[PDB]
A paper describes a structure:
Eukaryotic mitochondrial RNA splicing 2 (Mrs2), a homolog of prokaryotic CorA, anchors to the inner mitochondrial membrane and mediates the influx of Mg2+ into the mitochondrial matrix. The overall structure of the hMrs2 channel has a cone shape, and it is assembled into a pentamer with a central pore in the middle. The pentameric hMrs2 structure can be further separated into two parts: the N-terminal funnel domain within the matrix and the C-terminal transmembrane domain in the inner mitochondrial membrane. Molecular dynamics simulations and mitochondrial Mg2+ uptake assays show that the R-ring may function as a charge repulsion barrier, and Cl− may function as a ferry to jointly gate Mg2+ permeation in hMrs2.
Numbering used by the authors:
A (entry chain E), B (entry chain A), C (entry chain B), D (entry chain C), E (entry chain D): 82 to 401
Amino acid sequence: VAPVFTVTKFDKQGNVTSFERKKTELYQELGLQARDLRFQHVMSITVRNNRIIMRMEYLKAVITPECLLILDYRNLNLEQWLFRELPSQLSGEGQLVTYPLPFEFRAIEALLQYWINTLQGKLSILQPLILETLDALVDPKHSSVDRSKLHILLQNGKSLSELETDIKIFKESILEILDEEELLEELCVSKWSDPQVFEKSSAGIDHAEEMELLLENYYRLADDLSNAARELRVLIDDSQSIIFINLDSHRNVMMRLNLQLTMGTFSLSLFGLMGVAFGMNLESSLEEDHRIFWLITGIMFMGSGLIWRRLLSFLGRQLE
Amino acid sequence: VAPVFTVTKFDKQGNVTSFERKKTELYQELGLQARDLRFQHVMSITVRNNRIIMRMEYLKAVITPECLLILDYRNLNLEQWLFRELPSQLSGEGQLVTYPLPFEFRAIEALLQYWINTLQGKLSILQPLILETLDALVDPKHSSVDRSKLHILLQNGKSLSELETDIKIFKESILEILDEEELLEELCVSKWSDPQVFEKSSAGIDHAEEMELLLENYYRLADDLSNAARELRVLIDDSQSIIFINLDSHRNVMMRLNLQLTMGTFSLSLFGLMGVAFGMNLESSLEEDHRIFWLITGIMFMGSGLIWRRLLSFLGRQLE
Amino acid sequence: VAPVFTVTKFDKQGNVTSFERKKTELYQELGLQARDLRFQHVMSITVRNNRIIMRMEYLKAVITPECLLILDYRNLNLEQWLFRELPSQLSGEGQLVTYPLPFEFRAIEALLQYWINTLQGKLSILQPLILETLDALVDPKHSSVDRSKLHILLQNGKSLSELETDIKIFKESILEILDEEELLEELCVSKWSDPQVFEKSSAGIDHAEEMELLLENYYRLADDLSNAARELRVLIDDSQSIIFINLDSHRNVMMRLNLQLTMGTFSLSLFGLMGVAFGMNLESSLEEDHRIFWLITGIMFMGSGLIWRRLLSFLGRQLE
Amino acid sequence: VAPVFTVTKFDKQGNVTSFERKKTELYQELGLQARDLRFQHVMSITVRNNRIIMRMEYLKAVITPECLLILDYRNLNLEQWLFRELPSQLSGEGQLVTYPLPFEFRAIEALLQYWINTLQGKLSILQPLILETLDALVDPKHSSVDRSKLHILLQNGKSLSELETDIKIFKESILEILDEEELLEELCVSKWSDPQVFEKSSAGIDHAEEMELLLENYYRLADDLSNAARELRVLIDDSQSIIFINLDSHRNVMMRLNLQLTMGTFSLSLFGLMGVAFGMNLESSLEEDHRIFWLITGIMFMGSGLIWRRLLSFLGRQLE
Amino acid sequence: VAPVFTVTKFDKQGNVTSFERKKTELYQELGLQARDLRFQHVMSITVRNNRIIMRMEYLKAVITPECLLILDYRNLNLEQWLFRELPSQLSGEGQLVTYPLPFEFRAIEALLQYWINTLQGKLSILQPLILETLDALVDPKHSSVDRSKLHILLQNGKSLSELETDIKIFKESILEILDEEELLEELCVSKWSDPQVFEKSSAGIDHAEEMELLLENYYRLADDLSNAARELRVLIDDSQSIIFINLDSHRNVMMRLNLQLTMGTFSLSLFGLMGVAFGMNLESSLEEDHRIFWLITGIMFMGSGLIWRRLLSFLGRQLE
Ligand SMILES: [Cl-]
Ligand SMILES: [Mg+2]
Ligand SMILES: [Mg+2]
């Protein structure tokens, strides 16, 4: 009946243990209040009672000087990352560069690396799709654009805006932590767990400096991602403007050709009316004449041609 | 004759009392000047004479170390919240996380929670409507868009802009309070009411820190709301651009088809003029010939077809 | 020959005296240099030689600890405000809330109140006009918009942009003064006129704090005005986008209907050409037949209808 | 062979001397390095070795406590300003307000006044042209706009953007100098030339304060110029939007009228086809009847009218 | 098997040596960790263990107090710059202005000069192309624009956006270094290599001040580049708006002319229908009359002309 957390616990030795714990039991074990683990804010990093609470959207983590906890990890495709890369990164030959540093450094590096890799993967999925859709859409030899490609571009633009917002909030959180030295000092949970021990254990290694360098690295990576996303948005806008110009130019060409054909039709209809005037079954004084028929036909055709040419010249003058 | 406030008073025990009090009487009771309770600024939080004055649009509140007052609460549908949730939140088993803290913490938490819930409700009402309107409007199989849906989208966009402005001003007020530690210290009215008593009453609990954490929580919630609203605005703009492109593409397709039909009509009218030339009641030298009629009809139809095909090819060349 | 100021002087007792004074004489009386009273900057507030120099566009004022001066007040419709409200506000039962404070507080409050009321009046004039113009323009049942209303909207948008710039510069000046405590202290001219006297005269009343609260009040009012103006601009842009979409949709509907009618005309002209082929005065082998005439007429009409239906179906397929 | 500066030297007495000096000789005389006088940055003000180096685009100046130098003044139309106003401003009855102050104050005031006057002149040239072009272009009674006026507007908009950038960089330089008190102190070259002498020479006059006031004056003037330029840009954008709406409305009106005429033509052609069906030279059973001709003509005309009216009503229903 | 760096080493004497070194060997020689030389961030400047690590996109450099290293220099067309200009700049008569300063000053100046020259070259390539493309596109005498030029403009706009982003990140890095004095002090690697020696070696020359001046120079150059790029973007947007207006105006002119021709055709077809009514082979009572034929023809032509004139007048009234 009581709410519970599905907890994946990684020790300092990289051992992984999955279980479920009551919320009050977790609060008692971690020495934290209920309000600390509400996880109400997406992309939030805080330090409460010497414990690091982190949320990156669906990823909720609690870092202790002794262990790491992942909360609500089910039905999120996190199993591969949790049980394949994390043990190796924390307690193996992974790509982490904070192994000699205390456990919290490795934990923060792993979490930030996973989030930055997720953002990079989203961008690397979105970029080729948007690029090829724009290339198809801005093709100058198409009179009209493909509307299914327009729907695809709209969906990809929505996804790109969401990704850009995620990168922005990640950058904001990292920069807020980096700006204040107090937060950087608080992030060093192992240092403050036993200050007397770490007063001599830290043989010239500044934990705050290492944390600052790690956060600066991840902030720079997120800044590069944000720059790429903004460039993609700008390219999308420019491509949309080019598409508008192409459509307007095609419309103008078709309208000019239709206007020329309308001039031809109007001259043809005028001299056709002139001919039909002689086609009505009313007696005239020109039935007996032999050359009048050919004269009328010739002047009719020649006048149609001349009026069409004059109208074309008038159009050329009007369009300048 | 004198102006009055309709006052809803909540004690430390959660008891609710509704009455009306003269403005001067309220100023005397609260130890505040007339200018303090003007409530001229929407979404303003201030501390005057050890009392917290708050306005969130229509919600005007005065928080004292002993009680809370809601002013001008009538004809605003506030009765349900005032008489159902507030007593439970202040003096019961509500979702407030500041119960062990002094009364002002619970009061501020309740007010900020109500305002943030109002903003979230506005956004959760606006988002599905805007999403479905955009989905209907950006449908690529519609030659023209529904204008009633356009009016609905315009109204919802105005509402979304108003909501975004409200979220922005809420964030600005909260961040202005959070930036300066003096304002955070002033917000702890119970601490400064009896400094001698609270010098020993506060057994290791920092009231300023608790206030900072509460305000940071609500600021983060408002930031998430603002991000969602900005994403909705960006999606609206992108959908409008897609609608423009779709309409232009449909116009281009219809114009091309009309131009092809105009080519057909022009060729038909040209060779029809040629035929009508022989339809006039003028004597010629071809009436006695038998094959001339069928020859003229055949060459007329064939020339119409050939000129139409040539004009279509010319259009294809022009459009590239 | 020498330049002069038309000076309206208000004493501490609210007495008003209008006269003209030579520029050098005014400089000597006020203890100020010529460069101080250039009034080159619109919306500028400064403190020179213990005197407050203020300019709000056409309103130039000099506040002394003993009196207030309005300069160049003629031909600006300022007479009503100068001779009706200002005496009552300074030395009566006006709405000013700084009466117990020294004279400069009342003077600054009156000037800022007049300017904020002018801005509010401009906004309250512009808002209904813009709202009704947009409501008329975004009407979905209009095939075309009213261009006179477009000109009115353009003029009102220019006025709104000017008002927004005025509000922005007012906010900038007030915030620049508020940010630095030195400027706030300098604004208390009565305090620094006789520091020895005011060392004991100020019985617990902080003049700098009162000035800060007054300026914060007026800054918040200006911020609300700026938010309203920005919302109006955003609504104008959204209405323009909606108008564009409505016009494009009407164009598409008219173009589709014209294309259908063009299909009908083309089929009619094709089978009309077929009929005219038999209308020419050339001998054929079908004159004696009786049923051939009705057969040709029937097949002509039926083929016109069938070709029109096929073209309509082709259009439906093309538009998807 | 060696590079040289064309130097115009103004003494403290306003005497002007024009000559040419080798670059190394100028470096030796001014006590400055080669890198100091590169003048690589447009709109840059710096203090090197107690000398003020200023560049405003084409205007390069070096201010010393004893003299002023203008460099590369040829072929820039600077002769009038150099030899007419500068001597009077520096050593006469000019409009400068820093005459009792040391020479560098007058020099800086003259240079900043010239630059601000140049910017004001550019804006006062651009504003009437842009205003009249927009007024001509947004005329609602024009079916189409004048394209030569469009080219003029484009050129003026480019010039306005360049002017706005110049004002922005001028404001940035002035504000960067004003923000740091060290730069303001360094700008007082006469004070630091002989600190022992000026320790008693400055009888209560703060040179840093005077420099701050002068720079604040010029910054406020530049801010007013920037506000005017931004307002002009906003007005240009609004006028462009109004032009777009006007063109779309004219297109819609013309398209509706063309559609009505197309309906008329289609009905006329339908009943004309009906008439032509009886015009073919094929024997029928209605030649002998006398009333059939008039009956057919009457029903033809009446049906044309009725079908045209029905199509117009259908268009009215479709357009809503 | 192990990863290696292709290292180009420049000594203090300008001697160049190209070789390849294992990554671990380079880390040991430079006294740096593996994470220091990841080069994960484009356009990043840092100081680690008294060594300057710089990346400008493809250019990776490590500056030591004794030497400079270029890493991964192959297949980047860097050979000319590496083996022609760098030796002369570092140990010759180059344009560097930091020769008397320690080696790191010359190294930083050379690297920043190369990057700023690359950015200037990119801008000087992009600007004429964009300018000529816009001039061709905004030509008012073209009914339609060239779409190949549109594709060229789109590609150049993408390149310009990339260049603007590069300039922005360069400015951000330089300004981040300049803002904090600690980073400026750290950049002086020779000063901190032997602090005891440089305590007396630096005879009044402040290395931090020289570094600040160099970085300020390069920041100002990058700011000028960014201003030029932003002006180019603004000009591109304005040209696109002008192109839109030109296309709409041409469309309106063509549509008006087509509407006038449609009026003519409609009047011609109406009176042609009137004439054809008399052309059908049905007996009437007007065959014997002689003047009826000419009367009908004359009234037909005159009515066509009059109806066309009336329709033109109606169009003129409608367009206002
Ligand atoms: Cl169009
Ligand atoms: Mg006939
Ligand atoms: Mg359009």
